[PDB]
Copies of this chain bind each other. A is one copy, B any other.
């Protein structure tokens, strides 16, 4: 479950554990203890044999620094993404799909975590679907009526207008339908009665 927050710790652990193992590895020399080379060689040969270890250790340290820079860039990108999610998912209701959870974003709750943050995204997921019969628009008194903020559904016998994400049957009044054009330009229009309150 907490894989990435453990992977970032294991990567910093294996980087330090690899750097200490290179300390006890002769990079082309006669030994690995620096305090012993100075007691088994003359200064002429000491300056020669000690450089082959100092250079190797400096190269290993530069490699470690480069790996740390790349990892810090990756973690900076991740932290920028987490801050963007914090400002959009927690400090508001973002409409970006898949950004704040898998579904219709409603709210988010940030939680502290070792070297990270755990977002609790509350998403809206519909269920219990049902097939209906729909039409682009309806015709009445010669003029075509289009849905305002919904969809024209039908249960087989009657026609109603509901929401686009939740079923709520309502009568087709002259307050939720606007008129535009005649009933000879829309392909698929059905006939009905738009009751006026």
Contacts and interface: CB of A to CB of B under 8 A. Distances in A.
Interface of A: 28, 51, 55, 59, 62-63, 66-67, 69-70, 73-74, 76-77, 80-81, 84, 87-88, 91-92, 94-99, 168, 180
A176 to B, nearest CB: 9
A interface majority secondary structure: helix
9 contacts: A28-B55, A67-B69, A70-B73, A73-B77, A74-B76, A84-B99, A88-B99, A91-B97, A168-B180
Given A62-B63, A73-B73, A92 B97 contact: yes
A95 to B, nearest CB: 7
For A55, A80, A168, A180, which residue has the most chain B Cβ atoms within 10 angstroms? A55
A179 to B, nearest CB: 10
Contact of A98 (B67, B70, B81, B87): B87
Contact of A97 (B67, B87, B180): B87
- Among A28, A92, A97, find the residue whose CB has the most chain B CB atoms closer than 10 A: A97
